Design a protein around this nucleic acid. Structure first.
Lengths: 207, 180
DNA sequence: GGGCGCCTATAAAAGGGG
DNA sequence: CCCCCTTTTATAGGCGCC
């Protein structure tokens, strides 16, 4: 019955393809799964839940983090159960993962939003500075990234909607408005010094 | 010394009344009772002093929740046992025991969770997408702490008051080393 | 936009039900 | 083996819904 791994790898494969994940990721996921499985460390749970958590871990270990929401999307399991398994697995395998950062999502988010490299860089910059100046303490890095992207895009010709960004980043627009409100007071100090302001820093949305 | 004493916020204790009970009658006769077996298998009762809430099971065992001290939890526990007694049941008060204690306090300065999770990964879990606070599972004493960037700290899992105090003393130095 | 009330997480007991 | 039910509490970001 342990060769139920095959069914796990199939499921892993399925999920991975729904979001076109490179092979290194799927391989890592399979290894993680095999290791946890053979260890019999997480008794009483559902294999697909474990597999989905393994997937989530793999993306982070391979340096390109997916949010739990994203892994949830391609999975039959809930965020809550994936999260529970996630923590349980790190402990069983005596592993860890680097804390997530705003930068970890800047690339993919901006791509999905079809934003020009120039904006992507501005956002990335705004987020990093914002955190450095401790403007958004306690906020999720995903939230801060979403707000930075919003700020950036609104200062560019390629403007984006709180709703648009929120759908791609997987955060509610009020969540965006909250972080945005916190970074807005320092907008001038947050953009890259040589930035082409389609909309002047002032005329920026005053949520 | 931290010079800070964590404040007890909640105590959970159990006691055995010894005799089997009939929730329906209790629920009916008792004033501040409540019983919906469809919803939950026990009677929920509440006294205002000690401000508490109890869970009474037909087995005769009950759970006392809400007290801010061991003394107060036991006092309330007895008052509960009394109303049951007074409604005509061979109620005793066997094996009263504190099962969990919760404490909380403020180290008074912001904390760099990012840093703490870096050097303490072994005991930490800090995932912003899952919970805004860092979850610290201390081994000695076996207490779990919830640490927030604001400097507020919650401690739980204690069987005795000392465990709460000890865990906070153990964590204070660590936290100080991560002050913003 | 504003804001209430609940989600998430911690410990633990009770005793079923799944 | 695990989860849920429910109660209590500090703590607090995120978010459904009116």
């Amino acid at each position: 019955s342990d060769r139920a791994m095959m069914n796990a790898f199939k499921e892993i494969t399925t999920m991975a393809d729904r979001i076109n994940l490179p092979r290194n990721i799927v391989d890592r996921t399979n290894n993680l799964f095999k290791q946890v499985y053979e260890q019999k460390s997480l008794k009483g749970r559902a294999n697909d839940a474990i597999a989905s958590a393994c997937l989530y871990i793999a993306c982070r270990q391979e340096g390109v983090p997916r949010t739990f929401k994203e892994i949830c999307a391609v999975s039959r399991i809930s965020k809550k159960e994936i999260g529970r398994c996630f923590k349980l697995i790190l402990k069983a395998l005596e592993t860890s993962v680097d804390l997530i950062t705003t930068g970890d999502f800047m690339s993919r988010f901006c791509s999905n939003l079809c934003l020009p490299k120039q904006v992507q860089m501005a956002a990335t910059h705004i987020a990093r500075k914002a955190v450095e100046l401790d403007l958004v303490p306690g906020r999720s890095p995903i939230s801060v990234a979403a707000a930075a992207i919003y700020m950036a895009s609104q200062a560019s010709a390629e403007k984006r909607t709180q709703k648009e960004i929120g759908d791609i980043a997987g955060v509610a627009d009020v969540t965006i408005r909250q972080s945005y409100r916190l970074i807005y007071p320092r907008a001038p100090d947050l953009f890259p010094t040589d930035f082409k302001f389609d909309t002047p820093v002032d005329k920026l949305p005053q949520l | 010394g931290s010079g800070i004493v964590p404040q007890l916020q909640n105590i959970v204790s159990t006691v055995n009344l010894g005799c089997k009970l009939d929730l329906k009658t209790i629920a009916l006769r008792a004033r501040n009772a409540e019983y919906n077996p469809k919803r939950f298998a026990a009677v929920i009762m509440r006294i205002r002093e000690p401000r508490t809430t109890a869970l009474i099971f037909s087995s005769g065992k009950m759970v006392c929740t809400g007290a801010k001290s061991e003394e107060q939890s036991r006092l309330a526990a007895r008052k509960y046992a009394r109303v049951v007694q007074k409604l005509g049941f061979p109620a005793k008060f066997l094996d009263f025991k504190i099962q969990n204690m919760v404490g909380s306090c403020d180290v008074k300065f912001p904390i760099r969770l990012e840093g703490l999770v870096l050097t303490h990964q072994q005991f930490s879990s800090y995932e912003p997408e899952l919970f805004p606070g860092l979850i610290y599972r201390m081994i000695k004493p076996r207490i779990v702490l919830l640490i927030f960037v604001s400097g507020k700290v919650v401690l739980t899992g204690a069987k005795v008051r000392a465990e709460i105090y000890e865990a906070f003393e153990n964590i204070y130095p660590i936290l100080k080393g991560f002050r913003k």
